[PDB]
Amino acid sequence: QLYQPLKDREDDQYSHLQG
């Protein structure tokens, strides 16, 4: 394959305004 794909990207969850 000509361009390498990303493997398993680390979990990187951003918090949102809520309640």
Add this chain to the structure above:
Amino acid sequence: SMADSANHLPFFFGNITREEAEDYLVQGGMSDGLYLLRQSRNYLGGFALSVAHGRKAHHYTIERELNGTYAIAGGRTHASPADLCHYHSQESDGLVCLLKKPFNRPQGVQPKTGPFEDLKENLIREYVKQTWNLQGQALEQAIISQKPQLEKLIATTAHEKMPWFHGKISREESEQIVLIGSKTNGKFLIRARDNNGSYALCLLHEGKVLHYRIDKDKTGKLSIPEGKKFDTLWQLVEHYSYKADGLLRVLTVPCQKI
């Protein structure tokens, strides 16, 4: 607007990673409403609010809005991140909890800066001097009078001058130039593919050159497919120099030009 171009709060760590911010929150006890401020690593002029609650870390991106105010997505705007933090110490207003206790920089720890932040003021000075033919006070006044616009421009162009950026060179030229000299793992460059903000990351892994696509989406954000999104290439390079995050390995030494 911030009082200065740089943040100066005792609980601002500059451009530390999420992981370094979490390590500092653990060092500070991970008490509910313990918090620090860091520079956003993927939003230009942005910040991130890292706060402990429920023995977990919660991370909020604070964007710089077009008018020079700051806001978490969908929140009220504030003059500065200092104002944002003081406000959220009085009203939760959507945050997981009240901010109770700033975690301050330990004694003699300074805010972290990246390569770009260390070059930024001098790149702007050189641009105004050469474009407008100004010296001394006049130069200083001109920088100040257009500081915000100058910061946006230098951010969009600064990559061109940085050691890992080789401009418009072919896939073949890139493999050839990366394989010259010591086959140091993580040796890398970025090249342009067109004039329409499409690039490639070329990375040396066990004596073989890998190519990853870098694309500008419809927002103006650069990313490797399925990857973290950035406003600038220098942000992308700083991120993938800290951790692989899906690459076969972390970026190390920038491939020297010729």
